[PDB]
């Protein structure tokens, strides 16, 4: 029974500009997700810091943390829709709309400190030509081969951010829930 | 780094003898020790294996025995297909190294070489150059030492030595020693000398000539 | 069946890179670790890198490595050796080295290949300058005596020394190659009974395959 | 047969085709059995010594099992044993001890990723039977003590395989 | 819940010898156990290849495989006597008797081929004057810190060789039933 369940997490900080542009304008970014961010490598026989073979990422959590003050003026709001499947809007300084807004995934988020996270499931590029996905299953959900440094992006997320007079600044903790299974470990000798 | 000694790097036996031969290293290694068969243009060859394994193709008067630091390669009686360079081989931690190698020759009674010396030839002479040419053939053992005298003057600068391998058929050794002038300084001097002291004679041997 | 062919032979100049290869035959790569082993001329085996074809696992010996870059091409089974800012001191032989195919073979002898020869030289073909040795009129051995020719500057190596076309080719004594400025020199020697010559004429024949020539001289 | 008198370890792999299974057919049908369609349900992989009881300087193995193509590097004398700290380290004596392990296969579909399925009988997939490009299944990988005799094993590898999609061609006459 | 049981393994070979002596003679030997035989050191910021902090070790099997043919004369008969206090019985070649008989942790092994294991609990040694140690309990068994090399030796089992005028092999594995805790990994950044 090699099976295994773990929380894994990363974080980054993130800056949004000050913007001279009266009309309100929106900020496009994107979020891709590869596991070689989140695992070092291991050393001797092991190449993997983690001794297993097999993984599945169960959900994915994004945090995120600002540094801009409640005391800030300017306010303003985003928008938050999931993307999985790597066709993104473009990413853009001053779009002059938002085009998350009438997304099915789209959640709120408003600007500048406001706390947003995001508790959902990935889904990584088997072929960029294709791209093919599963629906909602924990059951059926596949297995990927624990790999050295060639492993697969999980498209995530698109995001949008109103533009502001004022910086706002993001640390931004992106937490995943991943299955494991076959516990690989090498022991040489002495 | 292991290092590995291997002694003695020169060694000299009659045929029908036995032979043994070590290598050493400054740790302690496993069945990782391979002893390899070099001769002369050939590449080296795999000899035992696991200190003592014969490896394919090796005939049954070779052995070998040994265990941490300490291994030999012994030769119950000797052939003269026998005559080679033996080299100790540790795979066990890297780098891999080898041993400086222990080069087997075939022994034989000693003998005094003949000595030759030459003149410059005329048609290199034309070319403004001069070299006076010895020879020192057939003897043995290989330990020789000559020197050039210039009107019983040393002369070290522009000496070039060769020897060639142990003789396949008498297994004598064989030097050649060249010493190159110019034209003009050649001219200048009368007396050209090849002295040579082998183990053969304590009066070292000498041959020398005069211009025409 | 199981055979490690390596490139030919390599002339360069110096400050020039090469690429050495040794093609396995009869085995896969995949299966074990290759090595390349330097041997200068006179001096003795040094062992330069690992590779782990499968992997692409690297392992060198400090010295060589900045210099030396060891590579594989599991798809042609195929290990390569670069070396790169030659100089003279690459001069030497290369071998490439590996294994059998797992399963328990640690063993099948060795096949440290046939070997390479790597020459980093600035010179160019150069014929030999060939000079015939005659003696100066003294008893050098009793009743015998001992001819000689000098074949000098030339490049590359190898020459061919013959007596006598072939018809001469006992107590001859062919001393090797030693450089000078960049050059070959090398001198055969012939030893025949007193009673031939001056009697009969001896030629020695020189040839020089990289120059394409061939030359004979006769003793006086 | 070895030398070396510390315990060594011969380690190999297996990897299985069904091309090695199959005739191929003749004249409309090119392959010997008729179907479009075929998933190895079992592989059932069996170890008949030849080595008699009689036989001394007796040894030990492990068999555990690899689904992913990345295998321990095939090894006549290993210092020691990698197969001992899996988790499908089966156990098998040497010379003359009798093996077997009934289990599962699992193919190659990309050899940069190596994903499969977990243990679904249900959702098992289906292969097209082809004429010889047929994938390799990545089965087991071995272990063997080494001893100073030789130790023979007449190895049966047996699959139970499902199959679907009888494709039969009847030409006239 | 970072509680984590697996079965941990090593194997070694063992000689018993050829004897001269008619009357039946005794080989004594001793057997301890420490992890850093059953443990390859981990590289970068994990000194060791596993990630736990604690560990405690269930169970210990001790097998028992002989090269030792079935066409072997000159049969005998050992005894195995499990020791957990380190005081041992002197490893001696040939003892004019059984040390091992009157034990209660007896059991007895044939000879030369016969098949043997003990499936039984370790105990470390904790300090070498007092030599004090738990009653068999699970639920109040101890933790130990996963140490890089300082790890304690298990005092495991005493043994005995009925000497015998040929040579007696034995392929002696030692399984263990290893618990764990605290799952301690580190990931150093790219």
């Known amino acids: 029974n090699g099976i295994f369940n773990t929380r894994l997490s990363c974080t980054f900080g993130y800056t949004v500009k000050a913007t001279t542009v009266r009309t309100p304008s929106w900020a496009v970014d994107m979020m891709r997700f590869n596991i070689n961010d989140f695992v070092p490598p291991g050393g001797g026989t092991n190449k993997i810091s983690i001794p297993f073979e097999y993984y599945r990422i169960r959900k994915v959590k994004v945090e995120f943390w600002p540094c801009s003050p409640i005391t800030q003026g300017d306010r303003g709001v985003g928008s938050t829709a999931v993307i999985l499947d790597d066709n993104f809007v473009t990413k853009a300084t001053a779009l002059t709309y938002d085009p998350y807004v009438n997304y099915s995934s789209r959640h709120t988020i408003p600007q500048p400190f406001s706390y947003h996270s995001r508790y959902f499931t990935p889904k990584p590029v088997l072929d960029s030509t294709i791209d093919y996905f599963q629906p909602n299953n924990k059951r059926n959900q596949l297995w990927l081969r624990l790999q050295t440094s060639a492993n697969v992006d999980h498209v995530g997320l698109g995001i949008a951010f109103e533009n502001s007079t004022y910086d706002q600044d993001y640390n931004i903790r992106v937490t995943m829930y991943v299955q494991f299974r076959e516990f690989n470990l090498k022991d040489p000798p002495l | 780094n292991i290092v590995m000694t291997q002694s003695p790097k020169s060694m000299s036996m009659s045929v029908g003898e036995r032979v043994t031969l070590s290598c050493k290293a400054s740790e302690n290694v496993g069945t990782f020790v391979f002893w390899y068969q070099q001769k002369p243009e050939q590449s080296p060859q795999l000899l035992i294996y696991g200190a003592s394994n014969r490896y394919t193709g090796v005939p049954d008067r070779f052995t070998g025995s040994g265990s941490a630091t300490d291994f030999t390669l012994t030769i119950n009686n000797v052939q003269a297909e026998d005559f080679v360079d033996y080299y100790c081989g540790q795979s066990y931690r890297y780098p891999l190294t080898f041993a400086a190698g222990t080069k087997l020759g075939l022994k034989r009674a000693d003998a005094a070489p003949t000595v030759s010396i030459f003149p410059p030839s005329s048609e290199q002479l034309t070319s403004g150059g001069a070299s006076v040419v010895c020879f020192l053939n057939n003897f043995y053992p290989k330990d020789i030492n000559v020197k050039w005298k210039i009107d019983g003057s040393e002369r070290q600068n522009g000496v070039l030595n060769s020897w060639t391998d142990q003789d396949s058929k008498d297994s004598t050794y064989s030097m050649s020693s060249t010493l190159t002038l110019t034209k003009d300084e050649y001219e200048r001097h009368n007396s050209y000398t090849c002295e040579a002291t082998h183990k053969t004679s304590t009066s070292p041997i000498v041959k020398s000539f005069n211009r025409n | 069946q199981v055979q490690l062919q390596q490139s030919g032979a390599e002339l360069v100049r110096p400050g020039v890179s090469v690429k050495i290869s040794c093609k396995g035959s009869?085995?896969?790569?995949?299966?074990?670790?290759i090595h390349w082993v330097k041997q200068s001329h006179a001096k003795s085996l040094e062992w330069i890198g690992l590779?782990?074809?499968?992997?692409?696992?690297?392992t060198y010996n400090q010295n060589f490595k900045g210099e030396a870059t060891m590579t594989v091409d599991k798809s042609s089974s195929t290990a390569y050796m670069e070396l790169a800012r030659l100089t003279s001191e690459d001069s030497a032989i290369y071998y490439c080295?590996?294994?059998?195919?797992?399963?328990?073979?640690?063993?099948?002898?060795?096949?440290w290949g046939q070997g390479t020869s790597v020459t980093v030289s600035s010179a160019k073909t150069t014929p030999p300058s060939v000079y015939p040795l005659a003696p100066g009129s003294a008893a050098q051995t009793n009743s015998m005596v001992t001819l000689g020719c000098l074949v000098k500057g030339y490049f590359p190596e190898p020459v061919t020394v013959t007596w006598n076309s072939g018809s001469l080719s006992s107590g001859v004594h062919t001393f090797p190659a030693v450089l000078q400025s960049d050059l070959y020199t090398l001198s055969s020697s012939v030893t025949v009974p007193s009673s031939t010559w001056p009697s009969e004429t001896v030629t020695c024949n020189v040839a020089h395959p990289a120059s394409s020539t061939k030359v004979d001289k006769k003793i006086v | 047969a070895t030398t070396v008198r510390t315990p060594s370890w011969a380690v190999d792999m297996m990897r299985f085709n069904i091309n090695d299974f199959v005739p191929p057919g003749g004249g409309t049908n090119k392959i010997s059995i008729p179907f479009e369609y075929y998933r190895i349900r079992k592989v059932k992989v069996e170890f008949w010594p030849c080595s008699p009881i009689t036989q001394g300087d007796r040894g030990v193995g492990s068999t555990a099992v690899i689904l992913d193509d990345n295998f321990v590097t095939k090894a006549t004398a290993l210092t020691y044993d990698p197969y001992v700290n899996y988790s499908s380290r089966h156990t098998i004596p040497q010379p003359f001890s009798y093996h077997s392990r009934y289990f599962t296969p699992k193919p190659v579909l990309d050899s940069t990723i190596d994903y499969f399925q977990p243990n679904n009988k249900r959702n098992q997939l289906w292969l097209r039977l082809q004429t010889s490009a047929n994938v390799d299944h990545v089965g087991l990988g071995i272990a063997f003590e080494n001893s100073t005799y030789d130790q023979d094993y007449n190895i049966r590898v047996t699959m139970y395989v499902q199959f679907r999609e009888f494709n039969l061609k009847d030409p006239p006459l | 819940n970072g509680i984590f049981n697996t079965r941990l393994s090593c194997t070694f070979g063992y000689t018993v010898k050829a004897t001269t002596v008619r009357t039946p003679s005794w080989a004594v030997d001793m057997m301890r156990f420490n992890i850093n035989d059953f443990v390859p050191p981990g590289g970068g910021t994990n000194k060791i290849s596993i990630p736990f902090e604690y560990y405690r070790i269930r169970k210990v099997k001790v097998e028992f495989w002989p090269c030792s043919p079935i066409t072997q004369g000159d049969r005998g008969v050992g005894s195995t006597a499990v020791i957990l206090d380190d005081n041992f019985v002197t490893k001696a070649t040939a003892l004019t008797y059984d040390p091992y008989v009157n034990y209660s942790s007896r059991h007895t092994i044939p000879q030369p081929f016969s098949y043997h294991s003990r499936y039984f609990t370790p105990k470390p040694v904790l300090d070498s004057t007092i030599d004090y140690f738990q009653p068999n309990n699970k639920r109040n068994q101890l933790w130990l810190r996963l140490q890089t090399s300082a790890n304690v030796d298990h005092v495991g089992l005493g043994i005995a060789f009925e000497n015998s005028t040929y040579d007696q092999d034995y392929n002696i594995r030692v399984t263990m039933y290893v618990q764990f805790r605290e799952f301690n990994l580190k990931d150093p950044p790219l």
């Open positions: 080295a590996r294994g059998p195919f797992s399963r328990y073979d640690y063993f099948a002898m060795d096949n």
């Open positions: 009869g085995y896969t790569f995949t299966d074990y670790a």
């Open positions: 590779i782990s074809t499968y992997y692409g696992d690297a």
